Design a protein around this ligand. Structure first.
Ligand SMILES: *[C@@H]1O[C@H](CO)[C@@H](O)[C@H](O)[C@H]1NC(C)=O
Ligand SMILES: [Cl-]
Length: 103
């Protein structure tokens, strides 16, 4: 009856020009109860401004869209490591997405 999200779906630009932002979307796989989306940029948590929840047959999908801005403090070794985590009381799952900053 209750179970954690089995994984997350992570979509977005994989290469962007320095100074621009990448549109990143995270969608949890279905969970019960609903999961909270947390974002991690280069190893540190950042706010989740909004998340949107949908019901499916199994449980609930949580979705969050963010824009990741590339600048001198967010870029490390010419990339940005983005991780999305989906957590409910039964456990959590996560995926990472690497944004390359092109020269
Ligand atoms: C989130 O982004 C996806 C494309 O990556 C888009 O289809 C969807 O409508 C967006 N949702 C919101 C609330 O912006
Ligand atoms: Cl791309």
């Amino acid at each position: 009856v209750n179970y954690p999200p089995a994984s997350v779906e992570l979509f977005g630009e994989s290469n962007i020009r320095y100074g621009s932002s990448a549109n990143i979307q995270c969608k949890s796989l279905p969970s019960n109860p609903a999961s909270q989306i947390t974002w991690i940029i280069n190893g540190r948590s950042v706010p989740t401004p909004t998340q949107r929840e949908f019901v499916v047959e199994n449980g609930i999908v949580s979705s969050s869209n963010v824009s990741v801005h590339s600048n001198e403090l967010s870029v490390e070794a010419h990339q940005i490591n983005v991780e999305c985590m989906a957590t409910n009381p039964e456990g959590s799952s996560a995926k990472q997405h690497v944004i390359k900053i092109i020269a």
